[PDB]
Write a protein that binds this ligand. Structure first.
Ligand SMILES: Nc1ncnc2c1ncn2[C@@H]1O[C@H](COP(=O)(O)OP(=O)(O)NP(=O)(O)O)[C@@H](O)[C@H]1O
Ligand SMILES: Nc1ncnc2c1ncn2[C@@H]1O[C@H](COP(=O)(O)OP(=O)(O)NP(=O)(O)O)[C@@H](O)[C@H]1O
Ligand SMILES: [Mg+2]
Ligand SMILES: [Mg+2]
Lengths: 457, 457, 171
DNA sequence: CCCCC
């Protein structure tokens, strides 16, 4: 009774082909879920699975025509969709899934339950996923060189560890991180170590995702981040020189959301799932077009302060205040990392840090005090208090301080506000910021401002 | 004779395949109407419906080639189009349709009468659609935190509810709503809750639909809005720092019409039905290039004024006038909502609000007062009116007031008009607006304005 | 179909524009709610578009199309309250214009006395509220069609210029 | 379609 339909029915009963909500067909081959939009892999699954069927059914699947017929039947059978990539604490490899909470490695049907449609791209080797090894010792020395274990670097080192370990989580993070340092401090070394450790879950993009409009037309540079767990942007075009495009704060806000809008070439899929830790490597501090409390909530900075130099340039490097430590450059490290020598040692370190910093919830917090741009605003937040009903009685002496009440609200005229605020910031140094604050928060009635200096109280 | 033609005739008689006005082919599979432009579903329907046909006819449908022949017959037989999505009070699910007027869930042929070709994408559960539940108390607490039940917030809160309930109606709305507030006020929480509640009827788009030419070319960002009952745009590139493209009033007007123009890749359907409540998440009020009563009549604003902060930054949050209340941030809420914990509780709340605000006709009303960009024009309503032929005798005092009789109609000079305007408002903060108004109302005979102030009478 | 005032102040070729393209075989077009020209500082009425739009063909790219020529059958009527002052006055606009005069006043009883004294309004009547309700019912559909057919038969055909009807065409 | 413009 239509042998080929029966074969398709059995293959469907195995649950090895699924239809996803984006319209892709994912197949379970070699202990991983795979898909290829440009070329479906269903006939590959049919050929591979021919060994699990009766003897008479297997001999039909050696003809490509019959495999195509079975594929047509399977495509007509799949009507409903499924959801994929819903477990944030599972690390998919090419031959199984690693449980980050437990540490157990699963294969076969154990790994199949988590419909992880992405993977590192390499096989998990449990012989190399060990704590004691010469590779581990070399990597420990390298890491302690890049981020020393001193008391002045404790917070910075902890933030470094937490940011690197968050690249294993399949969830949406609320902060973008800047690896900030001078030249030859180990930022690219860390980037390449992470890329080696996490394989295909890592991606590099261009700066257009920070300075251009994401929707526009086709944009693979934003559609390629779909389901990635780490996104790297490098070589910030510093903006001290005139004409440089600033970073769009709305781009930051859009990149911090669970879904990002953008499509590739020849595609109608306009929304991409955002699971990525976004890191920007820079020698210069960022400059944004507009500054507000929404942006100051999504920025963290890690600093690199160890210089690796040739013997000729060491002495001068010792007289630079951008460095706290000067070491000798090792010319064989780049090739060693390019060969994936520290892949599993760094993976073990990342898993250990994930355990360490995953008190029930792992959350990335901002560091607004590390950005000079924000400085002014922070200082303002420590100087002024919004006028409230509790300040009405204080008017008794507020008049002696220059305060004039109006509509039951304490206010200070523009001239008085300028006189009082010139005592905290240099007019030339903080001209644009002070003017912007005045314009943004100035009232009218002759201009008024609803703020009281904490010192007067 | 011609068994396959007879099978196609029977399938056509079942009424499970229809041709829409745009030319879509909609099929009825698994208790829902479905269409996939770039992936026809007629052969899936043939395979699924083979069971209703006689015994001899069903065995022929196991061959993909025979199914393709039957599909060719069926689509040659379909000459007349039908009307779809004409009931705005039916909510379609993956297994039936819910009546919003009464609250009865239909399945099978009962749901088939309403040709609802879109659905939430998930199955309606009767057990979880309950008024009392542990999740309902948490949802009520969250919603009350975001929009407190206080007199000062009464009216605003209602608008909130109304807008949210309007996401259930399958009709065209005449307003665009702006969710306005400072950072960490619950706007994105509300958006995620609504997305969870209404599934696939919710869509997210880019800001291009607000600041670009809708015609252009193949536009998936507009083609994806077809038959959607909720469209969200986020992160307006505000204009505090001037230099960004403004919102086009032409797009605002095109987005309130029953039909929109936009076509996907590899498809020819430039016509999309507009059922969507359009909501914009912003930290800054909008600014448009042109202001006119046509644009001023389709804008509404909802305020968010509750701050959720960590204990470290709470005290400062208590001295900001942008917040009426400060709460404690919960780090588990995001993951709870992302896992669809409050899907059915929020659906029940939305249905209750729909019943409450759907007295015979539900309508969305603009709130032009909130927008400051519209402020000056509004003052013109109380500033001056257009003189009629009834202001002849008044000129007896008009000469005393400054106006000079001319053409038997009250009129004012340019300098006199400027002097009179100076009384209502100061040109220091509105001088450019005064100049624009003078140019707009300029009349030349040596230019005079035939406008009468209300106070003048 | 009705058209706005954008066409009278914008170029045709430009980029993606559906308004001009949808004119294909469309049998009428009215520019309504005109941007009164008395507003100094606003762009004046362009005459190049007036001359071009009357051509037997229409040049312009329909959205998501690849043809820049379309049939032009629409009858062009521009309805406004203010006099037209062309941006540039030449022989083309002088010989390619006309004017229709309306002097019927629909005024409410409250404002009838004030409205009647207006010189512009010659006959003043009481506004009929239900007429709009009768318009949407399409009750005057066949009657209007019959009247239009009668007028077309009686008048048949062309449109003569009215240089005197426009003040700016005086000098 | 994208590119191109
Ligand atoms: N212990 C060490 N750890 C890391 N890198 C080391 C170490 N010893 C030597 N190096 C090398 O010193 C150089 C450090 O610069 P590298 O990390 O490549 O770039 P960067 O300083 O991050 N970026 P840039 O400023 O643009 O040059 C590389 O050649 C490293 O391989
Ligand atoms: N009761 C509560 N109601 C709403 N959000 C809450 C509540 N308790 C904690 N939160 C959290 O507080 C945070 C507020 O952020 P969010 O909901 O995105 O606000 P927002 O106003 O959209 N922020 P922003 O884009 O910066 O202006 C989120 O982590 C919420 O989950
Ligand atoms: Mg480098
Ligand atoms: Mg938000």
């Amino acid at each position: 009774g239509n042998k080929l339909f029966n074969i398709a029915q059995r293959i469907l009963d195995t649950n090895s082909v699924l239809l996803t909500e984006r319209g892709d067909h994912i197949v379970w081959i070699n202990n991983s879920w795979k898909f290829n939009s440009e070329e479906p892999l269903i006939t590959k699954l049919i050929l591979s699975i021919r060994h699990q069927l009766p003897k008479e059914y297997s001999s039909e699947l050696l003809c490509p025509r019959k495999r195509k017929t079975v594929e047509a039947n399977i495509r007509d059978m799949l009507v409903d969709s499924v959801e994929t990539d819903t477990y944030p604490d599972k690390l998919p490899f090419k031959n199984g899934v690693l449980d980050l909470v437990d540490g157990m490695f699963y294969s076969g049907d154990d790994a199949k339950k988590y419909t992880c449609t992405v993977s590192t791209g390499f096989k998990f080797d449990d012989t190399k996923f060990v704590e004691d090894s010469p590779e581990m010792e070399e990597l420990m020395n390298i890491i302690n060189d890049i981020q020393p274990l001193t008391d002045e670097n404790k917070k910075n080192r902890e933030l470094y560890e937490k940011t690197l370990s968050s690249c294993l989580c399949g969830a949406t993070k609320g902060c973008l991180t800047f690896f900030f340092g001078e030249t030859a401090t180990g930022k690219s070394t860390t980037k390449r170590l992470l890329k080696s450790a996490i394989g295909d879950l890592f991606v590099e993009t261009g700066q257009t995702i920070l300075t251009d409009v994401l929707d526009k037309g086709p944009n693979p540079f934003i559609a390629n981040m779909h389901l990635k767990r780490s996104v790297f942007c490098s070589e910030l075009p510093d903006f001290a020189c005139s004409g440089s495009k600033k970073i769009r704060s709305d781009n930051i806000k859009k990149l911090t959301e669970p879904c990002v809008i953008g499509r590739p070439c020849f595609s109608n899929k306009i929304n991409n799932r955002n699971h990525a830790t976004i890191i920007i490597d820079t020698n210069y501090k960022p400059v944004f077009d507009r500054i507000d409390n929404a942006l100051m909530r999504r920025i963290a900075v890690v600093r690199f302060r160890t210089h690796f130099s040739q013997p000729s340039g060491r002495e001068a490097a010792e007289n630079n205040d951008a460095y706290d430590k000067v070491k000798l450059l090792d010319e064989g490290l780049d090739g060693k990392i390019q060969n994936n020598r520290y892949r599993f040692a760094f993976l073990y370190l990342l898993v250990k840090w994930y355990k360490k910093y995953h008190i029930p919830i792992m959350k990335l917090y901002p560091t607004p005090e590390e950005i000079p741009d924000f400085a002014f605003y922070l200082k303002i937040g420590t100087l002024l208090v919004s006028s409230s009903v509790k300040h009405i009685p204080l008017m008794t002496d507020l008049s002696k301080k220059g305060y004039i009440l109006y509509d039951n609200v304490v206010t200070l005229p523009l001239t008085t506000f300028q006189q009082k605020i010139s005592k905290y910031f240099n007019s030339r140094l903080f001209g644009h910021d002070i003017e912007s604050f005045i314009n943004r928060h100035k009232k009218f009635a002759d201009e008024y401002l609803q703020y009281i200096f904490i010192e007067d109280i």
